[PDB]
Amino acid sequence: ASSTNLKDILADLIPKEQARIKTFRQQHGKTVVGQITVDMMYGGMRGMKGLVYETSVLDPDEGIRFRGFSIPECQKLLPKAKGGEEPLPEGLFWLLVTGHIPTEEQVSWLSKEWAKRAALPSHVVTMLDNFPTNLHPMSQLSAAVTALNSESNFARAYAQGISRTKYWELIYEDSMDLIAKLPCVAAKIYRNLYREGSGIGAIDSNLDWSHNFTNMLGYTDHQFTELTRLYLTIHSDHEGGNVSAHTSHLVGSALSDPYLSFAAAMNGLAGPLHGLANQEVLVWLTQLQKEVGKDVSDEKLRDYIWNTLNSGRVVPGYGHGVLRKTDPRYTCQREFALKHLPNDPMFKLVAQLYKIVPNVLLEQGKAKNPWPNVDAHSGVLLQYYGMTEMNYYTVLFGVSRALGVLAQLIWSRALGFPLERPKSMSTEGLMKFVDS
C-alpha cells in the first residue's frame, strides 16, 4: 500500500463507501426525509433536501465541518508550512478527498504534485494576454478554465468508451491538473489587469501551492503567504447547496469534465447574490472610515451604528446566518490580525465593530443572528497586504472553492451519481395539479 499516492489511497477507500451506500439505500432508500410544497418550488428549493454532497456539512453549533472536522480542529491538526502557523490548503484537500488528516509526508507529496502539473498551454496564455482590461476578472477566469478543457483526459477517455468503473480516476487526474493550473491562470489575470501585463514567472517545485501563488501574484511578504494559506483553506467548501458547488455538481452530473464543470461554477460564483459580500464589507468600512476618521471612540461608533440600523440600513457582514455564535472563519482571521497587524487602523475599526454591532443588533431586536461571518473580516486583511483590487476578490474565493467542489466531484463519479434532473412545472401546471 502506497503511503503518499493519493490515487492509490482513494482506490482503496472507494469500494467500502460504495458498499456502505448500497446497504443504506436497500434499508432506507424509500424513507421520506421531507415534503415538497408549492412555496418551495417558487422559492428556489429553500429548505428542500435535494442532494448528497459528502465533503462538508454545516454544524449549527460549530459552523462548517470538513469531513467531520471543525475549523479550529483543522487549524490544529492540518500540516503547516515550515516556520508557518496556518493550515496548508493541500492538507485540506487531502482531508476532503480521503476523510483523513494527512501526514506531513502526504502534504509534501501533494505540494510536489500540484507544482509538477502547473503548466498552462500556450493557447490559454495567448487568450489571457489578449483580454482587455474591461473584461471582468471572473469572466477571464471562467473563459480560461473552459479553454483549458482541451487538456481533459476525461473528455478524451469518455470518447474512447472507457468503463464506468474508471471515471473517477480520470476525473481525479483532471481535477489535480486544474487545481495545479488555477494559481497560474489567476495570477496571469491579476498581472494583466493590475501589473501592466508583467510575467508571472516560474513555479518552484519545492514550494507549496499558496506560495507559488503569491510569488506569481508578485507578492514577497511571508505573512501574506500565510494569510493566503488560511484564506484558501477556510473558503474551500461549504456544503453542496451554494450556487458554485451546486452548479459544479449539476454540470458534472452530465459527465462534463472538471474544467467545464468548474468554469460553469465560476459563472455562478460571479453572481452578485453569491460572490460579493467580501467586497461589500470593504466598501462599507472604507466609507465609514472616510466619514468619521481613523480614530473614532467606541461611544461615537456605537451612535453611528445605532443610527444606521434605525434608519433601515444594515451593517454588512453581520445579521444573517444559521449560527448561534461567531463564524469560526471570522475568528481565524481576527486571530491572524491580532498577531500580525494589531496597529492597523482599519483592523482596529473592524475590531471595534465586533464589540459593538452584535449588542446593538440584539437590542434593536431585528436580527436572529447578531454575529458576523467570514466576509466581515477578509477584506481588511487583503487590503493591508496591498491586495486592494476588490473586483479580484472573487477570483481568490474561486481558487479556494475549487478544492471543495473538485474533491466532491471525484466522489460523485466514484459513487456513480446520476444526472441531476428535477421535474419542473409551469404555474398553470401547478394550479391544475393542486386542484387534483
Just list the catalytic residues: 274, 320, 375
| 426 touches a second copy (CB under 8 A) | yes
Q: Applying CB under 6 A, which residues contact ligand OAA?
A: 238, 242, 274
- Residue 290 as a binder of a second copy (CB under 8 A): the answer is no
46 marked among binding-site residues: no
Contact characters 249-278, a second copy, x per CB under 8 A = -xx-xxxx---xx-xxx-xxxxxxxxx---
> C-alpha angle 141/240/175, rounded to 5°?
45
Q: For a second copy, which is the closer residue by CB, 55 or 75?
A: 55
Candidates 16, 159, 311, 365; binder of a second copy (CB under 8 A) is: 159
**Dist CA 72 CA 62 (whole Å):** 9
What minimum distance in Å lies between the beta carbon of 316 and a second copy?
13
DSSP code at position 56: E
Place of cell 468554469: 263
Mask for 303-322, x = binds a second copy (CB under 8 A): --------------------
Across the beta sheet with 63-66, what order do the strands follow?
56-59, 63-66, 69-70
Residue 1's binding partner out of a second copy, ligand OAA, none, with CB under 5 to 8 Å set by partner kind: none
User: 49: Cβ–Cβ under 8 A, 6 or more apart, which residues?
Assistant: 33, 34
CB nearer to ligand OAA: pick between 175 and 236: 236
Smaller CB separation from a second copy, 176 or 269: 269
* Residues 381 and 336: beta-carbon distance below 8 Å: yes
* Cβ at position 351, least distance to a second copy in Å: 28
When CB distances are held under 5 to 8 angstroms depending on the partner's kind, the choice from ligand OAA, a second copy, none that residue 253 binds is a second copy
Element of type H or E holding 58? strand 56-59
Q: Tell me which of ligand OAA, a second copy, none is bound by residue 272, counting a contact when its beta carbon lies within the kind-specific cut-off of 5 to 8 angstroms.
A: a second copy
Least separation in angstroms between CB 273 and ligand OAA: 8
SS3 for 72-139, per residue? HHHHHHCCECCCCCCECHHHHHHHHHHCCCCCHHHHHHHHHHHHHCCCCCHHHHHHHHHCCCCCCHHH
* C-beta of 242 vs 248, nearer to ligand OAA: 242
Q: Which amino acid makes up residue 165?
A: T
Neighbouring-strand partners of residue 70:
65
Report in angstroms how near the CB of residue 263 gets to a second copy at its nearest.
Answer: 6
* Binding residues for a second copy restricted to 380-419, rule: CB under 8 A: 417-419
Q: Is 19 in the site for a second copy (CB under 8 A)?
A: no
CB burial string 399-427: b at 16+ within 10 A, e below: bbbbbbbbbbbbbbbbbebeeeeeeeeee
If one asks whether residue 178 binds a second copy (CB under 8 A), the answer comes out as no
Alpha carbons 235 and 237: distance in angstroms, whole number: 6
Could you say which of a second copy, ligand OAA, none residue 81 binds, taking C-beta under 5 to 8 angstroms by partner kind? Answer: none
Q: Which cell numbers in the block locate residue 377?
A: 473580516
**In angstroms, what is the minimal distance from the CB of 381 to ligand OAA?**
17
Give Cα 260 to chain centroid, integer Å: 17
CB nearer a second copy, residue 113 or residue 257: 257
329 annotated as ligand-binding: yes
Q: How far is the CB of 27 from ligand OAA (least distance, A)?
A: 32
Site for a second copy in 79-138 (CB under 8 A): 123, 126-127, 130-132, 134-136
Closest residue by Cα to residue 116 from 200, 184, 189, 204: 204
* Residue 141 or 399 with smaller CB distance to a second copy: 141
Residue 39 interacting with a second copy (CB under 8 A): yes
Q: Is 21 in the site for a second copy (CB under 8 A)?
A: yes
Among a second copy, ligand OAA, none, residue 430 binds (CB under 5-8 Å by kind): a second copy
Contacts of 159 (CB under 8 A, 6+ apart): none
Cα of 136 vs its chain's centroid, Å? 19
d(CA 319, CA 281): 13
Q: Around Cβ 434, how many Cβ atoms within 10 Å? A: 8
Task: Count Cβ neighbours within 10 Å for each residue of 248-287 and write b for 16 or more, e otherwise.
Answer: bbbbbbebbbbbbbbbbbbbbbbeeebbbbbbbbbebbee
Q: Choose, by CB under 8 A, the member of 74, 110, 147, 171 that binds a second copy.
A: 147
Residue 423 binds to a second copy (criterion: CB under 8 A): yes
> 43 or 345, CB closer to a second copy?
43
Q: Which helix (H) or strand (E) holds 63?
A: strand 63-66
- List the single partner that 29 binds among ligand OAA, a second copy, none, CB under 5 to 8 Å by kind: a second copy
Return the residues of window 214-253 that contact a second copy according to CB under 8 A. Answer: 239-243, 245-247, 250-251, 253
Question: According to the annotation, is 195 in a ligand binding site?
Answer: no
Binding residues for oxaloacetate: 329, 401, 421
Binding residues: 329, 401, 421
